[PDB]
Amino acid sequence: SKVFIRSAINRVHQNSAANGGELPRIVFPEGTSTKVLKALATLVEEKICQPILLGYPERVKEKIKALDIPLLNDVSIVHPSSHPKYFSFVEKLYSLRQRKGINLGEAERLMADPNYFAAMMVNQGEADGMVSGSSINYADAVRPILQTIGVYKEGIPAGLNFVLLEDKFLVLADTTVNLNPTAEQCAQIALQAAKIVEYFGIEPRVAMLSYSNFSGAEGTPRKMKKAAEIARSLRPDLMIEGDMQADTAVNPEIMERLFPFSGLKGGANVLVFPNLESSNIAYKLIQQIGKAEVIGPFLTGVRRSANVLQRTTTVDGIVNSVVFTALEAQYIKEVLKS
Amino acid sequence: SKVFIRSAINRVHQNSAANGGELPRIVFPEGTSTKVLKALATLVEEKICQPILLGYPERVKEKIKALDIPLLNDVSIVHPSSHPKYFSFVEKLYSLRQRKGINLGEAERLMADPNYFAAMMVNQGEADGMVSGSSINYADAVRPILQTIGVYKEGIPAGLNFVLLEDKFLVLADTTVNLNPTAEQCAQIALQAAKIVEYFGIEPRVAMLSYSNFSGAEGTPRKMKKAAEIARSLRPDLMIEGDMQADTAVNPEIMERLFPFSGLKGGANVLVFPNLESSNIAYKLIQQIGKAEVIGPFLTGVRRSANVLQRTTTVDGIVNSVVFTALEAQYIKEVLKS
Amino acid sequence: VFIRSAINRVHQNSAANGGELPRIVFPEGTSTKVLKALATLVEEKICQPILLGYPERVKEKIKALDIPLLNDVSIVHPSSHPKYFSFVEKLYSLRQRKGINLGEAERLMADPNYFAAMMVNQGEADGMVSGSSINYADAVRPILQTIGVYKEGIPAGLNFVLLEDKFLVLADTTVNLNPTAEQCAQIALQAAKIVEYFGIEPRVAMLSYSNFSGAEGTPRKMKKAAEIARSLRPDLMIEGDMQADTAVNPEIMERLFPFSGLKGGANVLVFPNLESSNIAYKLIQQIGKAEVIGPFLTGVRRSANVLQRTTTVDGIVNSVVFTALEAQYIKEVLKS
Amino acid sequence: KVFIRSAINRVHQNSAANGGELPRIVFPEGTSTKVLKALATLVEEKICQPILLGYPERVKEKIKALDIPLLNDVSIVHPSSHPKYFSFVEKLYSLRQRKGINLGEAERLMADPNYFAAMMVNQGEADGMVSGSSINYADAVRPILQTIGVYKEGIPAGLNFVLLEDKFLVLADTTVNLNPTAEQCAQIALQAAKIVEYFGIEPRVAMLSYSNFSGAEGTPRKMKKAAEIARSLRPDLMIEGDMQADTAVNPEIMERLFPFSGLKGGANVLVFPNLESSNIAYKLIQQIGKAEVIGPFLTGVRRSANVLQRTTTVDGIVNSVVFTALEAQYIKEVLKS
Amino acid sequence: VFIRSAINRVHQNSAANGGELPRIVFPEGTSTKVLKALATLVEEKICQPILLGYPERVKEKIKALDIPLLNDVSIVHPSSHPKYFSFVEKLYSLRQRKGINLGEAERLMADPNYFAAMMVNQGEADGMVSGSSINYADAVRPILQTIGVYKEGIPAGLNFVLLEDKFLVLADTTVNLNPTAEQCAQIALQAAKIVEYFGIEPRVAMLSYSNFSGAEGTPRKMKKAAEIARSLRPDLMIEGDMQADTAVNPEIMERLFPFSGLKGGANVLVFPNLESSNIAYKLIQQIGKAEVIGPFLTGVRRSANVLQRTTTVDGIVNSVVFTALEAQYIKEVLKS
Amino acid sequence: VFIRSAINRVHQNSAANGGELPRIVFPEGTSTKVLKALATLVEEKICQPILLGYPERVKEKIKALDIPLLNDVSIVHPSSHPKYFSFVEKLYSLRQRKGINLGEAERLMADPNYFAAMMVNQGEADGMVSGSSINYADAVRPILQTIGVYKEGIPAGLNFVLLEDKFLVLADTTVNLNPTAEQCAQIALQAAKIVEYFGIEPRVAMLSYSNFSGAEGTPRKMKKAAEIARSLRPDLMIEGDMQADTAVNPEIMERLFPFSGLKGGANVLVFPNLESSNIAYKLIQQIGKAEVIGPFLTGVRRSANVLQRTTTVDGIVNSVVFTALEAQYIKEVLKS
């Protein structure tokens, strides 16, 4: 139940040791959020990250005392408009977005907000990653990240969750960003999810989900059939199939008995959804009524390490999410050193 | 999870004993379907129904003997084109659909098909219910039912599934029929699911699911917020709320902590979905990877007793589905004693 | 005139290779008008008919109708035929990513229309004729799903209007609700080829409610259809957009639109939508004083034709003669 | 030809009840060869008094080149020099001043024979008009619709008669509406029915489709609904649809295959789903059937005005003018009621 | 002249009301042009200004600009104001079914634009003026979300063109991209009532690129807007569709369109889309010889105006004078 | 002054061509304001006017107006012109697949607007000026159908605002309801070349209600129009999306958007739709205190301009002076 998460913690430790013992600097814009602070007590004990809290230092240190969490007494607290880099950060956002309606006045007002300040910190290398969204809706938390840090080349911003089963994990995407991805977008989501599965030493086997089995009819069935064709043309080395129903996808015996002509054998471990209603409802329902741990969402497709929590998260969910944000920050920091 | 199903079995028996010992006559158009026949061995042993098989008697009896299946030697096997009521049934389908493109030629050709013949048997009272779809896709199996038996007044054809948890069940709909139901259709689906929950002695508490919490924004959030408003005016005695995410819906602690203004307290036990992708994927994923039994889909909104299996069903799934079809057939047969 | 030469043309083909008559399967084994027509067709050695149905029910109808020549016609019940499960597997193989698994294939192959289409596809018959008792959409769907269209073809119905110096070809009278400019050009090329098979020069008009207006909508569409077809067959006279009397009357064309590329009157009329084609051929047939034969299904890989359900017995006879000709043509193409 | 001779006799019969005066029919195409040749017959048969529009010199020159003596004293009116010209300009302006027609536009339009003819009819200086022999239908019909307009709940629609051996068939709308709605197809049907009743015949109406009683999305559903709407407005008539064209006209096909239908004995009024189907059908029947087809006749408009098909023969013009004369006489009676 | 009369009504209003001046909050406490304008406005007893920001950095800007009269001005930092958490709760109460929970409400209320809107909404200020340093959309959204539109109202920007003998009103210059006919009628009525407050008879033109054409698109929309508005205020001259020179020039209208119901020239011009209204007032402002004041936000429940970010120091002075007038009018309405 | 310099260049062009004056045909031979304008224009040796109409009714209007220099003006009645039937054949030749047969061609060619257009097309006149009496759409349609656009040209109206230090050019003020980004760039290039003919460097702003936002709709379209135009004339300053005051005021541009490629103020303003351009130039003309001349039709193969029907007499004089300049320029390009 816990095995995949403690293997992640152990990989964070191996990465820290291979780099002087340094921990990733993870900035939290919600410096007074009760669940973030309670989670950070566990995370600092486990040497997962060096946290940076954003807010008015007096009020963050007020909240830490009311919650009685001494292990954070040293933790750095930064008030955005008083940080020495504020004016350079204002200038950078203006430079990036002056033809997207951000003049100096808009940049100045946005950079005062902790979410924008956290995103620019990560973009500029003043932090290695960020974790936000514990106290506000996903759209408002993710917009600063997409506008500031942006997507890498050909990337698509997309949320991913792991369902931690007994044999294996299953990856679900896109659980957070795209309302109704096109066939081309679902293929790119599949490739992004696939390289994450490969990072963990697993063979990705991809199903494009629908309410139909290999019907190819207009609408969602046709879209997910074409998504699988596009993804296969970009990664012909992977098993990728669709359109198919969700039990057809995960159960190898159903697949073999009913659709043995299919190219997907042994059950899918990457499930790509046709719309945001389906992915968002599915991972949340599994999390609540299944008997498996679900971790995420993790934001993929973006140039730097940045993750948005689901606002319904528990304290333990934040701990799990920061562990994988630390792993992502370490990976990206090593890419930026080659 | 065996308790909710064994209680249904005992209610089928109590209904039979309260009516002369009659068992409900359930017709199965797929007379040679391996899983249907294996299921019927258990269903006859458990005195759930009088099964009627459709097909060529020697091909059906050959399959029963090749599978070594007892208790089916007395079972009625009917070939549609040789049944005495065939031409009357042709006459009736023409009468019903002559301005929908069904002349006598079309009616004769359709009525030779077991799925069409089974539906007319139920419509005309020659059977008390039917169960189909073990060997063909849902759209093709459900179309004869909707075209022949049709919806009751203001009903909407809609599939419903039960998730049987340890302390409660959850109802999911519409898992099979409507691709993208309107706000008005999602209210009617909720009302149909609510009356099913009440038949089992439980108070229904209804959530209109979205990827959003009380955002009411254009698109799905607005549709599901409005669907809850319509349903509240139609059943002002019930807790009905939306738009909300799936974990907000089922977890009473999340709702109270984050949205205490909501009218839904104590957790939803009826989940109404915004489109068929989300509902169909969700119940199949829960069934495969959750550790709870999922029964259904059950076709609601139709004038007579008729259910379509998921073609991915197991034999035990068919046994479970027929138990509840028997209950529906007994209930409708007793309403028709007015 | 035109029909008797076609009948002789079937006999000419039979003698030339094998001596065998084309095997034509009729899925509607109990259809009264089909059975009455087959009395004439067997007497004239047009085809070896294969009827689909329950043998005893088909034999009751033949006896009840008192038709003597059908005493030993072959009658086949789909589910009992030795090739039934082979046909089921083939349909699954063809359509498994179009929603047809083995369960769907078994259910469909028990239906005579599907079984007839597969018999022809597999070479167990040389052609089929259906649609005497059901609507065209339901009769043609199994053919298109099983046999399919040839490379770059478009399924399209074609009718012949038989005047005294002339025949006119009308298309597409049955399939496409609202064909695009590209589709109307392809329909034109398919019709032009049938006309050439009968030794006639095809002269094609893309019909509209307009004369060379080129305005948005149907006029622009039919103007472009003629341009596309001209680029694909630069050797033919093809013109549009033009009205129907402009198209067929060489005098109106010369007097009012001498700049047009179509002179001497069109004998191939391509229609802009299915309302116009379907109503027009049926009205000419009923109230005109010319015989109309067809519709004939063009663009498909094997020989298969769907009757209009309003057909007379004599209309079935005419349709089967040309189905036999198509079957012989395709069957001889399929050796080389 | 029986049906045409009976119409000719009713024009004379109507003339006898009013002093012997003939309807004044204006022809804007004063130099059109086929119009002039047709008028020689029409003046001979006392169908109408024609009024030609143009330059008197060019019109009388053309009459002389074709050697048609019976037209050497027909009235010729040049729009811009006629005494009512400035009055006509003011009227078109008064009618269309919030439809983009000012005094400048009205002066320019009224100088054109088609507009001048339409206004002559609108103002009672003529009893009817016939145009469209030399220009496309759209340009000929637009001045009529803009000047005279539709009567209340009316719809502009062209109608043709197929004169069979023992009935006529009415086809509509063969000229105006590209793609009428179900509601418009109902109104076209009612307009055609009242014309059929004028000739002493019972109207039996079919809404044509490529389908028989399918009711499927698109044209089948539209023509099924057109029949329902029209039936509610004239519950005394047989009106049915959707149905195919041979189903509609052949009583034996209808009785054999669709005995539940409300249309028995065959339709004599065929209402078409779009302009492609109606325009092609009447032209093809006219060219290749062996029945006479007369029209199109413009229905739904407040005064008598018809537009010929530009492909017309001289005898077609003669046939069309006879029924325009009848229409002109009918409207002149109502305008005294 | 029109401006001295507005100032002078603010003064009469302040008189007879204890000497009280309207409390106007400016969220942009460090904005150079806002501070420079306030030197003139407090000097002239127009308003008691409240500046939002970090007090220490606002006084820093005031000293750099050498404005000694602003030393005693009230400066409020949103997050430390005693009512801050009360304001958070109010926004949550208003917008909890529009996606604003306590977390969102608390984050938004820390922003000066949101804090100013709530101050006005709760009666802690009598009006607000924003938008000198950020785009109009970002400045107006908090006002629309917090204060909202009154019943049947439409949010719409309005400008006055102050000519020598008269003023012209233009709307909607800021809010609606492409108003419907119904919205353009409601905009006309809102502007008409403002003109009546200044003692003038409103004469309304619905502007288009066409004169009385009524053709599909913009001509039909503006013809219909005038018909709708005429039915709601039949006592007023309201006409359209018409071009802009037809609208303002009584001689052109009389010479070319004497049938029109608009005589004596329009003084209210309602535009068909935001491109036309926004470009028009700015171009007249830059190259004409007339003063243009505004835009003024109409249709909202309390006094709140958004500057054009291109404003001069005089523009801000002009705008605040009329915001003060609006604030005083509203405060009396809320006194019954 | 700008107009007086134009008149002098007409004379300088005339002197260099043997003293010949351009032949300008006016289809509105009886239009009061045209006739009064021609009194000034013939006195100023601007053009040789040709009036269309009935020679008797035209001379009847001239004498009643008392215009002595018009005594020997050429007056042409289209149906009586010796080239009439040649012109009918030419219009038929051009448009026979656009719905114009010989009958339509005869009827249209009898209309002065069509006849005036064909005279210019065939070289029987050097230019035409119409639209004093009728709406712009009806006046411009014959020109576009007969003369047409030069290759890749776009028909577009242009107006000059004659300011004190400079002029501003506005387009497209008359033709395109809602030009695409690609069309807006082409309008910019045409306007740029006219400004260069007057010896001035064009600086182009793509106008919007937004400043450099690039948001969907008009902002994105005008940002993209500027990008396309820059790639076609990399030597010019061309920028967008921007508001109208940002565009014309160099101090606003430098203070608020110094990253912009446009410095020193735009003198060419390209509008996003016809509502904005048409209302703007008419409002500036009526309530600004600067003269506005035009509209002038650009993008067409020959010299032809449509007046605004609301024009004054002095406006027609101004318009004809520049039509004369265009006619003279075009005649030496056609001597290649």
mmCIF file of N, CA and C in Angstrom, chain C residues 257-284:
data_model
loop_
_atom_site.group_PDB
_atom_site.id
_atom_site.type_symbol
_atom_site.label_atom_id
_atom_site.label_comp_id
_atom_site.label_asym_id
_atom_site.label_seq_id
_atom_site.Cartn_x
_atom_site.Cartn_y
_atom_site.Cartn_z
ATOM 1 N N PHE C 257 -27.288 29.676 -74.507
ATOM 2 C CA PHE C 257 -25.965 29.559 -73.890
ATOM 3 C C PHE C 257 -24.973 28.949 -74.872
ATOM 4 N N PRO C 258 -24.706 29.619 -75.997
ATOM 5 C CA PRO C 258 -23.782 29.044 -76.986
ATOM 6 C C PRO C 258 -22.343 28.957 -76.501
ATOM 7 N N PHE C 259 -21.983 29.660 -75.427
ATOM 8 C CA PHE C 259 -20.631 29.559 -74.891
ATOM 9 C C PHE C 259 -20.386 28.232 -74.178
ATOM 10 N N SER C 260 -21.444 27.491 -73.852
ATOM 11 C CA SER C 260 -21.309 26.254 -73.096
ATOM 12 C C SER C 260 -20.503 25.214 -73.867
ATOM 13 N N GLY C 261 -19.842 24.327 -73.117
ATOM 14 C CA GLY C 261 -19.102 23.233 -73.709
ATOM 15 C C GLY C 261 -19.911 22.010 -74.067
ATOM 16 N N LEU C 262 -21.205 21.998 -73.765
ATOM 17 C CA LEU C 262 -22.077 20.858 -74.031
ATOM 18 C C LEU C 262 -22.980 21.168 -75.220
ATOM 19 N N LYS C 263 -22.777 20.459 -76.328
ATOM 20 C CA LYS C 263 -23.604 20.613 -77.518
ATOM 21 C C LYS C 263 -24.210 19.270 -77.919
ATOM 22 N N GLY C 264 -25.423 19.329 -78.471
ATOM 23 C CA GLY C 264 -26.140 18.141 -78.890
ATOM 24 C C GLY C 264 -26.951 17.449 -77.812
ATOM 25 N N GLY C 265 -27.082 18.048 -76.629
ATOM 26 C CA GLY C 265 -27.899 17.505 -75.561
ATOM 27 C C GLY C 265 -27.175 16.523 -74.654
ATOM 28 N N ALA C 266 -27.395 16.628 -73.344
ATOM 29 C CA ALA C 266 -26.795 15.693 -72.401
ATOM 30 C C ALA C 266 -27.577 14.389 -72.373
ATOM 31 N N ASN C 267 -26.854 13.281 -72.240
ATOM 32 C CA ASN C 267 -27.463 11.988 -71.962
ATOM 33 C C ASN C 267 -27.087 11.446 -70.582
ATOM 34 N N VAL C 268 -26.285 12.173 -69.809
ATOM 35 C CA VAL C 268 -25.991 11.814 -68.422
ATOM 36 C C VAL C 268 -26.328 13.019 -67.559
ATOM 37 N N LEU C 269 -27.276 12.844 -66.649
ATOM 38 C CA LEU C 269 -27.734 13.906 -65.767
ATOM 39 C C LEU C 269 -27.319 13.573 -64.345
ATOM 40 N N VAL C 270 -26.451 14.406 -63.772
ATOM 41 C CA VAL C 270 -25.992 14.269 -62.389
ATOM 42 C C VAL C 270 -26.754 15.277 -61.536
ATOM 43 N N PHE C 271 -27.352 14.796 -60.444
ATOM 44 C CA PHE C 271 -28.272 15.577 -59.626
ATOM 45 C C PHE C 271 -27.564 16.160 -58.405
ATOM 46 N N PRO C 272 -28.057 17.302 -57.907
ATOM 47 C CA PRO C 272 -27.391 17.965 -56.770
ATOM 48 C C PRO C 272 -27.762 17.406 -55.409
ATOM 49 N N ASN C 273 -28.891 16.713 -55.279
ATOM 50 C CA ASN C 273 -29.266 16.112 -54.003
ATOM 51 C C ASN C 273 -30.245 14.976 -54.271
ATOM 52 N N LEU C 274 -30.498 14.193 -53.219
ATOM 53 C CA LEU C 274 -31.289 12.972 -53.335
ATOM 54 C C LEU C 274 -32.774 13.258 -53.527
ATOM 55 N N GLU C 275 -33.290 14.346 -52.946
ATOM 56 C CA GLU C 275 -34.674 14.726 -53.216
ATOM 57 C C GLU C 275 -34.905 14.884 -54.712
ATOM 58 N N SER C 276 -34.005 15.599 -55.395
ATOM 59 C CA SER C 276 -34.230 15.902 -56.809
ATOM 60 C C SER C 276 -34.108 14.654 -57.673
ATOM 61 N N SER C 277 -33.110 13.805 -57.399
ATOM 62 C CA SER C 277 -32.905 12.613 -58.219
ATOM 63 C C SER C 277 -34.013 11.588 -58.001
ATOM 64 N N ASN C 278 -34.372 11.346 -56.739
ATOM 65 C CA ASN C 278 -35.333 10.292 -56.426
ATOM 66 C C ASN C 278 -36.734 10.661 -56.901
ATOM 67 N N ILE C 279 -37.156 11.902 -56.665
ATOM 68 C CA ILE C 279 -38.474 12.310 -57.134
ATOM 69 C C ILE C 279 -38.530 12.301 -58.656
ATOM 70 N N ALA C 280 -37.502 12.820 -59.302
ATOM 71 C CA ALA C 280 -37.492 12.944 -60.773
ATOM 72 C C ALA C 280 -37.616 11.599 -61.483
ATOM 73 N N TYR C 281 -36.802 10.610 -61.146
ATOM 74 C CA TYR C 281 -36.907 9.314 -61.849
ATOM 75 C C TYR C 281 -38.257 8.657 -61.581
ATOM 76 N N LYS C 282 -38.803 8.804 -60.392
ATOM 77 C CA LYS C 282 -40.093 8.176 -60.113
ATOM 78 C C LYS C 282 -41.237 8.892 -60.826
ATOM 79 N N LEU C 283 -41.171 10.221 -60.935
ATOM 80 C CA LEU C 283 -42.218 10.950 -61.647
ATOM 81 C C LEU C 283 -42.193 10.654 -63.145
ATOM 82 N N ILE C 284 -41.006 10.666 -63.755
ATOM 83 C CA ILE C 284 -40.915 10.323 -65.174
ATOM 84 C C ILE C 284 -41.472 8.930 -65.413
#
